[PDB]
Amino acid sequence: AQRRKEREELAQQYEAILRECGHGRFQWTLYFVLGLALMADGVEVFVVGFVLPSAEKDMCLSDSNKGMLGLIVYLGMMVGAFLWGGLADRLGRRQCLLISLSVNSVFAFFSSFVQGYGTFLFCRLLSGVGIGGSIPIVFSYFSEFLAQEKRGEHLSWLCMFWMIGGVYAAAMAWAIIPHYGWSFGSAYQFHSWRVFVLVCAFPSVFAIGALTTQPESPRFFLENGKHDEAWMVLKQVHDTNMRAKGHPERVFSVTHIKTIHTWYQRWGVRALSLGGQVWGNFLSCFGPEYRRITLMMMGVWFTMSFSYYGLTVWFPDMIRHLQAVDYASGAYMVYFVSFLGTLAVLPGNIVSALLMDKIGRLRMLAGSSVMSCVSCFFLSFGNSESAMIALLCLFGGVSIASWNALDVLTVELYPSDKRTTAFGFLNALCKLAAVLGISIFTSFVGITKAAPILFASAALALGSSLALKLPETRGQVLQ
Ligand SMILES: COc1ccccc1NC(=O)C[C@H](C)Cc1cc(C)cc(C)c1
Ligand SMILES: CC[C@@H](C(N)=O)N1CCCC1=O
Numbered sequence: 001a002q003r004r005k006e007r008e009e010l011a012q013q014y015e016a017i018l019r020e021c022g023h024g025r026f027q028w029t030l031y032f033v034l035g036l037a038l039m040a041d042g043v044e045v046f047v048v049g050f051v052l053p054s055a056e057k058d059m060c061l062s063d064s065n066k067g068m069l070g071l072i073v074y075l076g077m078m079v080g081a082f083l084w085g086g087l088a089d090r091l092g093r094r095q096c097l098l099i100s101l102s103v104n105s106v107f108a109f110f111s112s113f114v115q116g117y118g119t120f121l122f123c124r125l126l127s128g129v130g131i132g133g134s135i136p137i138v139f140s141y142f143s144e145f146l147a148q149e150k151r152g153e154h155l156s157w158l159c160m161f162w163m164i165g166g167v168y169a170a171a172m173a174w175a176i177i178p179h180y181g182w183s184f185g186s187a188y189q190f191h192s193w194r195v196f197v198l199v200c201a202f203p204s205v206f207a208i209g210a211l212t213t214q215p216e217s218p219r220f221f222l223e224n225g226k227h228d229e230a231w232m233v234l235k236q237v238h239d240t241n242m243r244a245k246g247h248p249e250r251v252f253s254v255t256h257i258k259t260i261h262t263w264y265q266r267w268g269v270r271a272l273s274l275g276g277q278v279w280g281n282f283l284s285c286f287g288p289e290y291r292r293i294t295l296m297m298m299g300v301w302f303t304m305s306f307s308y309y310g311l312t313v314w315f316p317d318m319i320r321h322l323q324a325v326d327y328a329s330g331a332y333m334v335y336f337v338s339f340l341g342t343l344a345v346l347p348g349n350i351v352s353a354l355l356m357d358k359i360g361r362l363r364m365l366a367g368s369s370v371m372s373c374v375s376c377f378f379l380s381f382g383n384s385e386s387a388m389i390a391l392l393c394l395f396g397g398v399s400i401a402s403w404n405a406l407d408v409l410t411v412e413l414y415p416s417d418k419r420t421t422a423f424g425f426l427n428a429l430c431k432l433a434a435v436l437g438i439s440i441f442t443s444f445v446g447i448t449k450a451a452p453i454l455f456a457s458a459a460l461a462l463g464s465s466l467a468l469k470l471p472e473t474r475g476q477v478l479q
Pocket of ligand 2: 038135162407
């Protein structure tokens with residue numbers, strides 16, 4: 001009873017404080033700084049999806065082992081997503097983002113000097129574990145600096161760095177190791193997978209470097225009884241915004257803010273308490289206050305991730321199959337298609353950013369899901385390479401909007417003391433759905449074109465049937 005009242009007072013006051021701070025230089029700087037972190041995740045996703053299996057096929061491996069790396073690394077991503085989402089609530093957004101990025105960068109760096117297959121697999125799996133927490137923590141961290149008046153518009157532009165990271169990974173793959181053989185012989189003569197591995201780590205390293213300049217979120221401090229730190233961070237935000245706008249004379253007027261109140265021996269108690277608190281936060285997502293919302297968000301996330309990841313990983317393979325069939329009558333194609341998809345997303349990002357705060361998140365999600373279901377089905381009508389590429393561009397442009405709406409809903413549907421936990425759980429479910437979709441769809445490449453498309457269409461139809469039942473978060477203070 002009492003705690004809900006106090007947290008409602010804090011939520012009401014936080015939006016007023018943010019309106020006093022306003023939007024400007026600080027938010028955009030933080031936007032770029034976290035865009036680097038999302039770029040790291042996009043790079044890892046591309047590497048796992050496309051580089052590793054191609055390498056395995058180009059590797060001295062038994063037929064039974066031609067697809068293990070992607071599966072195991074995605075499972076590691078799932079585990080890391082849940083782990084880092086759970087901890088971010090208790091340790092902080094910036095702290096957990098730094099730790100996860102550090103793990104990712106370190107184990108990426110190690111993977112360059114491995115010599116076997118098990119060791120490279122191990123290093124890359126731990127790297128996947130590290131990066132898995134980037135998306136939940138980034139989306140929870142940035143949204144806490146945004147006022148309700150334009151939170152949806154500003155959150156819709158984060159996904160571009162994911163696309164740019166994927167394009168970067170594809171371009172580096174083409175430039176350094178274009179459909180070369182893979183061995184663990186090359187002597188790291190630039191044109192070796194080791195250098196590509198090292199190059200792909202740069203976005204994460206730069207994200208770590210830049211991230212150490214930004215301030216921890218004030219909402220986390222206020223939710224945990226740290227008044228003075230939150231006040232200083234909010235004053236920093238206000239001063240930066242006003243000094244950049246040409247009004248340095250202004251004074252931050254907020255007086256007081258509502259707040260909510262041997263080594264092997266100490267570490268044991270600390271770890272047990274952290275685990276208990278994280279598990280308690282997780283179970284709260286299934287209580288009577290949130291059980292329905294969580295159960296429907298699970299379905300929406302699962303279906304959307306299934307369809308999207310399955311189609312994206314299946315499309316290059318079926319293009320290669322079409323080319324092979326025509327010939328019977330490589331690495332550049334993936335990069336070109338990635339660049340085209342990144343261009344196609346941009347109109348969708350513009351439209352979603354414009355309409356998110358006007359038509360609401362629910363209508364964006366539902367309409368975009370219906371359009372994605374229809375456009376994905378149109379893939380069955382394409383016959384030539386160009387037609388397939390154009391239809392996929394249409395699918396991506398109409399689908400990216402639903403992802404922005406889903407991200408905004410996931411941010412706004414859960415309270416600030418459990419936001420990262422719920423987002424991490426749903427992102428782990430998304431990674432599991434990606435595993436299942438990539439495993440199922442790719443098996444049909446040499447058999448039939450219709451089955452993957454129909455499965456994706458049915459999954460998107462089911463997902464769009466659930467999106468209509470979620471509540472609308474438009475025009476409400478950040479929980
Ligand atoms: C932007 O590229 C990435 C960014 C981050 C992770 C992976 C990838 N790329 C892929 O998965 C390959 C795939 C073919 C790209 C693509 C997707 C969509 C919806 C539409 C088009 C036209 C292309
Ligand atoms: C940050 C981008 C990310 C997301 N919305 O969580 N995306 C884009 C489509 C596939 C995916 O996971």
